Design a protein around this ligand. Structure first.
Ligand SMILES: N[C@H](Cc1cccc(-c2cccc(O)c2)c1)C(=O)O
Ligand SMILES: N[C@H](Cc1cccc(-c2cccc(O)c2)c1)C(=O)O
Ligand SMILES: [Cl-]
Lengths: 260, 261
């Protein structure tokens, strides 16, 4: 049977080729996860079909209905066989689907407009002239809300009450806000996206400071799926063979627009 | 009517260390460190009682090419001498085939250790010169990383290292570290970032980690296939990371107990 792969349109993971209308199936798409899917399938010996997740979401469980949405939903309810996307390995997700070991490691990080005099979370926490915030929902916001660490607690206390609101509805808005606030806003987001935007025109942002924590993206399969074992082994193999780092460098830096 | 969980681990600082007064103590109380604290946390979140034991042969786990027998902590798992391994054991392909690994509790990569003063700041810096010798363990994955690499800088480094005389390779990690410290600024050692970070915080505070990591791997908790502990242990690792506990333990053992300010 043909393996149904669910994934999501997010750059540089999966992107529509400019000439996609003249192509068909897997050839329509390009990117890090398109390249990765090809490698996984090769090392697992299966045929596959990339499908873009219907609702355009990663995967969360509705607090009321208890229904999983997004790619996780597609696995849980039996609509897809495997998800290959920048899907963070989390406890609540691990409870309902299987994850490979991480194909990418990352953490919360600081994005600034070039020239902003901030180089760390501690720097942000000790001042007020430069506003800063996170997505208005999800794990990067909860990271601060729940934190017991002095610096992060100080940041949360500021962020939760800052006016005008420092939270943004989407990642794209966070990035736009940094770019359009004249140095007066810094955005807290995934280091991977931060690194990617730094290499995109108009080349006016920078990632600064260390990552504030450590998480990973994993390939996901329905709980108890027979594909899980071989997929996990393929991920470890590709990492030991340097292929994962090669794909990251290709899509983030070789294709970078901001110089060497 | 019950069975106590047997944990295998390995004496490697600061993961598991003998307390100074270990002879006055008994059982699990003899030991301290990051993985000792982690063991207690895993047991609590999985509801099991346990016994810490140090791996009999003092090794991590490798499969002999000839006899096909696993040694180390992996061997203790696959041959039924221990139930779980809680140690800085790298998640690797060959190990994952025979045992189950949790998601990583620590992530890390190859890094460069210099004696303070050495004019090297990166792998690129090393590769461009020979005045400062540099090398890796004389066996294992960190050596193999360079040998198999098709990246220009790492290829150039491998070409130098493989033929360098006197040998730039070392039999143990301890020897690499001592060689950095005792080579008067003329040796740099390539090793795990975690060990590099740790040693930088030990007296005599004469070493420094430089440059970014060259790759990314993780340490995982290991259980045999079909283990009744496997699922719960993995959920516990993810939970502990989400609750900040893993970063808290790293900070405690690396920095709060550091000696170099
Ligand atoms: N990757 C997206 C967004 C997403 C979802 C859940 C967690 C995180 C995350 C990433 C790095 C550090 C951190 O503390 C949290 C990101 C997804 O999987 O929905
Ligand atoms: N942790 C020890 C030694 C050990 C074994 C296998 C791999 C690595 C390692 C760590 C970081 C980067 C890298 O490329 C390789 C370390 C063990 O598990 O035997
Ligand atoms: Cl070897």
């Amino acid at each position: 049977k043909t393996v149904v792969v669910t994934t999501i349109l997010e750059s540089p993971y999966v992107m529509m080729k400019k000439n996609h209308e003249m192509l068909e199936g897997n050839e329509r798409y390009e990117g890090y996860c398109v390249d990765l899917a090809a490698e996984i399938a090769k090392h697992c010996g299966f045929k596959y079909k990339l499908t873009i997740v219907g609702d355009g979401k990663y995967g969360a469980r509705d607090a009321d209905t208890k229904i999983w949405n997004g790619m996780v939903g597609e696995l849980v309810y039996g609509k897809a066989d495997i998800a290959i996307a920048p899907l963070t390995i989390t406890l609540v997700r691990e409870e309902v689907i299987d994850f490979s070991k991480p194909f990418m490691s990352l953490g919360i990080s600081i994005m600034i407009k070039k020239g902003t005099p901030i180089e760390s979370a501690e720097d942000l926490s000790k001042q007020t002239e430069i506003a800063y915030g996170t997505l208005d929902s999800g794990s990067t916001k909860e990271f601060f809300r729940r934190s017991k660490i002095a610096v992060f607690d100080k940041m949360w206390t500021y962020m939760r009450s800052a006016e005008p609101s420092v939270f943004v509805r989407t990642t794209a808005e966070g990035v736009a806000r940094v770019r359009k606030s004249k140095g007066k806003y810094a955005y807290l987001l995934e280091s991977t996206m931060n690194e990617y935007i730094e290499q995109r025109k108009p080349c006016d942002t920078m990632k600064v400071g260390g990552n504030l924590d450590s998480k990973g993206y994993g390939i996901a399969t329905p709980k108890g799926s027979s594909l899980g074992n071989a997929v996990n082994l393929a991920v470890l193999k590709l990492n030991e063979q340097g292929l994962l780092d090669k794909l990251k460098n290709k899509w983030w830096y070789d294709k970078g627009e901001c110089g060497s």
